[PDB]
Design a protein around this ligand. Structure first.
Ligand SMILES: Nc1ncnc2c1ncn2[C@@H]1O[C@H](COP(=O)(O)OP(=O)(O)O)[C@@H](O)[C@H]1O
Lengths: 63, 443
């Protein structure tokens, strides 16, 4: 009766919000997950509206 | 530093042309002994090549003819790539273990097991540590770390929060974390945070932030000897005996198991075997039981090359009552090739004294070097080399910047050479206590 959806309890893997490659790192400032220093450089250089789009592509938002 | 100037400090290698094994007339701090240096370089080549097991080489020659120098030159020209064990033959007369056991451990020390491994290491400056310690502790906490190139925040598991509190990790600390163990080493304090370290004294050093990625695989090449594996397996903290001593006689079946396992690791490709050198200085201090053991220890597949030095002529073998060349039994000498060191010519003494006068901070005037060379011919290389230090100290007492003949003459007058010391003894035989115990104390 639309009570057929199911949550999950397993710990989820971490992927880079930009390249989708695995992400060891979560940026404390913009909260984007990122693969390496090259992508961290881009992420900190993004246009101010773009950071919220990378979050929103995985349904996340900063506020 | 903690290394002072010592008798061999000028030896930087073997001084041989690596392309041809031609000894250069002098280089790397060795002078002359060219044929002996060529032979030691051929030994050095087959040490590095590893394919040949349990050959023994004796370096034979009069005292001060550079036998230890050539041994030190080989050690300096092998470096860390190959195990190099130095044994004075006096050392095996342990009270803890039989001398064949002591001599076994020396052979085991001279074979390396080379093991290559990786770990992810995380390294950076701590931007923050938050730990709630919510009555109990270590409940939850977050770590922020930066390099010059990245910043990241981490939720910490509770046994990592224990590690962080155990190491009193603080904002501004530069740390490395080995992830699989979870140990934290504080590499230093970041300079930008210096003012927060109000408890640290002014003697404290500071560092720049780490550079590049926070995390990378760092690969370590361990080399561990067969002796270390033997001792590790002896008891529940067997390695702890690698330091204090207090290894017993390690049981033969432990060694036999380890030899099989190391052959498995080789065949599995997990490890490589790196045969080293055992150098036995003044090997004639060994006795006839030792030589009988060595004869068959050399036939093992896991035997190093053994290099030996003897001052002795035809001399009494220890633990028996007959004489043989070098003081070594002929059945042992049948297993050994011999390198001879010859006496030095006056110009080679001059060069060695010059090198020794460079290794100590000494200026020799040209006449002082000529006189020390003359003393070297007359009284031996070692004595003239000890007059170098003495003359500099006398020159400094008279505040001279260079050592002059006057300083060498004071040295020669104040300190007797071995021959004048013997002549002094041969004159004073009534005042010196004789082999009969007799002595006269009257004037
Ligand atoms: N060919 C050489 N080149 C440079 N230094 C040498 C040479 N031969 C001997 N020496 C030095 O002279 C001293 C005595 O020689 P050493 O090697 O101790 O002789 P031995 O070990 O045969 O008594 C040592 O300090 C050594 O470094």
């Amino acid at each position: 009766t639309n009570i057929e959806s199911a949550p999950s309890l397993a710990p989820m893997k971490h992927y880079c919000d930009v390249t989708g490659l695995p992400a060891p790192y979560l940026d404390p400032k913009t909260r984007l997950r990122y693969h390496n220093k090259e992508i961290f450089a881009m992420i900190r250089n993004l246009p101010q509206g773009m950071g919220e789009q990378f979050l929103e592509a995985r349904g996340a938002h900063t506020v | 530093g903690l290394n002072l100037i010592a008798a061999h400090s000028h030896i930087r290698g073997l001084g041989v042309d690596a392309d041809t094994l031609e000894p250069r007339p002098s280089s790397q701090g060795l002078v002359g002994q060219e044929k002996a240096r060529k032979a030691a370089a051929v030994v050095l080549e087959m040490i590095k090549q590893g394919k040949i097991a349990g050959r023994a080489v004796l370096i034979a020659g009069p005292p001060s003819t550079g036998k230890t120098a050539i041994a030190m030159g080989m050690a300096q020209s092998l470096g860390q790539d190959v195990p190099f064990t130095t044994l004075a033959a006096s050392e095996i007369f342990s009270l803890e273990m039989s001398k064949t056991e002591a001599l076994t451990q020396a052979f085991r020390k001279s074979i390396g097991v080379r093991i290559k491994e990786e770990s992810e290491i995380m390294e950076g400056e701590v931007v923050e540590i938050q730990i709630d310690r919510s009555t109990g502790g270590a409940k939850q906490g977050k770590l922020t770390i930066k390099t010059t190139d990245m910043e990241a925040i981490y939720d910490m598991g509770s046994k990592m929060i224990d590690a962080m509190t155990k190491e009193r990790v603080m904002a501004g600390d530069i740390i490395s974390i080995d992830k699989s163990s979870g140990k934290i080493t504080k590499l230093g304090r970041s300079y930008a945070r210096s003012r927060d370290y109000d408890a640290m004294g002014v003697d404290t050093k500071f560092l720049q932030c780490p550079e590049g990625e926070l995390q990378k695989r760092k690969e370590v090449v361990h080399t561990v000897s067969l002796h270390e594996i033997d001792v590790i397996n002896s008891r529940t903290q067997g390695f702890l005996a690698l330091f204090s001593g207090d290894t017993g006689e390690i049981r033969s079946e432990i060694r036999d198991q380890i030899n099989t396992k190391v052959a498995e690791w080789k065949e599995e490709g997990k490890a490589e075997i790196v045969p080293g050198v055992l150098f036995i200085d003044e090997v004639h201090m060994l006795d006839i039981e030792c030589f009988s053991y060595i004869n068959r220890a050399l036939e093992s597949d896991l035997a190093p090359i053994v290099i030996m030095a003897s001052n002795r002529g035809v001399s009494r073998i220890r633990g028996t009552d007959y004489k043989s060349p070098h003081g070594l039994p002929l059945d042992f000498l049948d297993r050994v090739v011999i390198i001879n060191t010859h006496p030095y010519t006056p110009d080679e003494l001059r060069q060695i004294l010059s090198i020794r006068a460079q290794e100590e901070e000494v200026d020799l005037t040209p006449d002082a070097l000529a006189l020390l060379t003359k003393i070297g011919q007359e009284a031996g290389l070692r004595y003239a080399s000890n007059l170098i230090t003495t003359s500099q100290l006398i020159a400094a007492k008279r505040r001279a910047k260079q050592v002059g003949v006057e300083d060498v003459q004071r040295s020669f007058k104040l300190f007797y050479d071995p021959a004048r010391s013997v002549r002094f003894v041969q004159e004073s035989e009534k005042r010196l206590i004789g082999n009969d115990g007799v002595v006269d104390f009257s004037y």
